[PDB]
Design a protein around this nucleic acid. Structure first.
Lengths: 66, 127, 217
RNA sequence: AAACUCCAUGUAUUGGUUACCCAUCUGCAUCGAAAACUCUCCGAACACGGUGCAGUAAGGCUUUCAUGGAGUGGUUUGCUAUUUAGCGUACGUGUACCA
RNA sequence: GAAGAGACAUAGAGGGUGUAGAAUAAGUGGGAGCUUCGGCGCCAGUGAAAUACCACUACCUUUAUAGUUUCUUUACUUAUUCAAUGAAGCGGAGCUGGAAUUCAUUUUCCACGUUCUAGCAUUCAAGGUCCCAUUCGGGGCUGAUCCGGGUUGAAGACAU
């Protein structure tokens, strides 16, 4: 048994100011350490999220925003 | 209020994948397939194998922090069937039955334009 | 080889004794101790021993010793001025090892008889020997006065699992030259018994029993 | 047919409590056969798993004479979405377990 | 040089389960004693262990001094290596022109006299300005920004 999920940092994801409520969700990553750090493994993430999630209105249930 | 993951049910024929990732898709949480629950080799794609696989995914989705999922249904796609397998419905239903909340169910079967040559030949698979 | 600077240890002993006697003073009979450690020594894989060295005088003249034996050594102990007991009671008293441990704690040293070597390992065996004050049987023809004085001036080396062996050396109310002789002879004997000589010993710290922290070496 | 595992009373030292018996580091004999070409025999093979012996003791180094009493018969390693169970159910070694 | 994984020194930690005493106990031998408490232990019960005092600290992580025989990675240039040239324009800063929505911050970034044509391009360069003592001409500065004297590029403690 290793359980690699007890060793990640659980970050948080925001949105740009050109939106409504900007709390998208969390992100499970790694504990950043030395020897090939896991801090820059969070620089290139890409998140697909629906516009109705980012606006609160179901009129944009389509148009998923990346 | 709710911590959201991505469910990503790959429902082909011959198998069924329930691959919950993080919201960005890069980090994997409890990929459990239908062949991991039954050992008969002809019911890997069966609804019973998919429902057991989905509830084992929800067993690890809890005790890591995931309380809700965005469901992405996947058939084989490409030059293949484009129709979801028999286990996608059981896997999706078992996720709801297990307490994990659902949101924005979407079909993400890879759909080409016209494309490379589908396998089988001119006269197709004739049995 | 003696790795001890004589003038420096003499000055350290004189200042430590001045601290224990003149600067601070109490009616408590304090006991200077040698707690000698071990460096690069592994107790488990290396053979050990339980040995008895002698001293020029008593490390602490108020240290209780008990005797078990025949009525002859009982009456000799009565002439000595030390309490004496019988042996039939101990046959019943073997049952409560808790009480045996309590009496071993209350009487911090024991002596026995050449007839009691028959009954000791079945009745007084476990708790007393765990306490480790090994009883050397006296001789009825030999002087019990002399044996009592011997146990007054014995030192017990019991090398155990811990790497720090601590034994009392003497006092402050008595003279000082014999105390320095005691400490020097004790460290010389320890160096002789150590199987790597001075390599095993890492320090030699003597501290006036009610005093502060300091490291000699 | 009975055998043997243990407790106490204790004789030489059974000794030195993290108490002989936790003991394993190590070598020295091998637990015989699937309802196997039905079975059986010899032979190529060092043993097809636990006990015995020794040097090493997280007691300082041998196991000492003895007697009395407590004490057995079963669950087999598998398959199957009947899974708090439906079929199937070698013996020789210790396990797990029960009353 | 820097970062990371160290280890050894470094000096200070405290804490550590069954039982059951008077404390959730891994320690020494102690027989009573410093004192803001008559509190703690003591002759008392009960505990594999008696309890203030650690006094050597089994076994330590955590550090901030300050380290040194390392292991990896990443940089520096001056050893070494490669190439070129008649060692001619390198680096840094500027001035000008533009874009920069200057916010009175070169805050920033690009450009630095040449592209219809098989012509021509040389005399410390003309001009401007200063000094000649100007004897027909001569010498500065500018023209042609300043500074650093690292020829320029690559590569680098690897390679050789």
């Amino acid at each position: 048994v290793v359980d690699p999920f007890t060793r990640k940092e659980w970050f948080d994801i925001k949105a740009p100011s050109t939106f409504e409520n900007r709390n998208v969700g969390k992100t499970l990553v790694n504990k950043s350490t030395g020897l090939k750090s896991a801090s820059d493994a969070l620089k290139g993430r890409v998140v697909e999220v629906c516009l109705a999630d980012l606006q609160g209105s179901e009129d944009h249930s389509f148009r998923k925003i990346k | 209020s709710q911590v959201f993951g991505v469910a990503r049910i790959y429902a082909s024929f011959n198998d069924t994948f329930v691959h919950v990732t993080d919201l960005s898709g890069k980090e994997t949480i409890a990929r459990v397939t239908g062949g991991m629950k039954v050992k008969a080799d002809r019911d890997e794609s069966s609804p019973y194998a998919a429902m057991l696989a989905a509830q084992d995914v929800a067993a690890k989705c809890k005790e890591v922090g995931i309380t809700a999922v965005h469901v992405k249904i996947r058939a084989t796609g490409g030059t293949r069937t484009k129709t979801p397998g028999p286990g996608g419905q059981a896997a999706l239903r078992a996720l709801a039955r297990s307490g994990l909340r659902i949101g924005r169910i979407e079909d993400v079967t890879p759909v080409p334009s016209d494309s490379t040559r589908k396998k089988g030949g001119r006269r197709g698979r004739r049995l | 080889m003696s790795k001890i600077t004589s003038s420096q240890v003499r000055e350290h002993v004189k200042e430590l004794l001045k601290y224990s006697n003149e600067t601070k003073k109490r009616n408590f009979l304090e006991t200077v101790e040698l707690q000698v450690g071990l460096k690069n020594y592994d107790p488990q894989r290396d053979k050990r021993f339980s040995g008895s060295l002698k001293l020029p005088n008593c490390p602490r003249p108020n240290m209780s010793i008990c005797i078990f034996g025949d009525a002859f050594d009982v009456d000799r102990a009565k002439s000595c001025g030390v309490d004496a007991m019988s042996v039939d009671d101990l046959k019943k008293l073997n049952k409560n090892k808790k009480l045996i441990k309590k009496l071993s704690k209350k009487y911090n040293a024991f002596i026995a008889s050449e007839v009691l070597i028959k009954q000791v390992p079945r009745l007084l065996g476990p708790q007393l020997s765990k306490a480790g004050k090994f009883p050397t049987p006296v001789s009825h023809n030999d002087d019990l006065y002399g044996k009592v004085t011997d146990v007054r001036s014995t030192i017990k080396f019991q090398l155990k699992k811990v790497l720090c062996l601590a034994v009392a050396v003497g006092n402050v109310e008595m003279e000082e030259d014999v105390l320095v002789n005691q400490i020097l002879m004790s460290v010389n004997f320890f160096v002789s018994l150590l199987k790597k000589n001075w390599q095993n010993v890492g320090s030699l710290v003597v501290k006036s029993s009610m005093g502060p922290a300091f490291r000699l070496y």
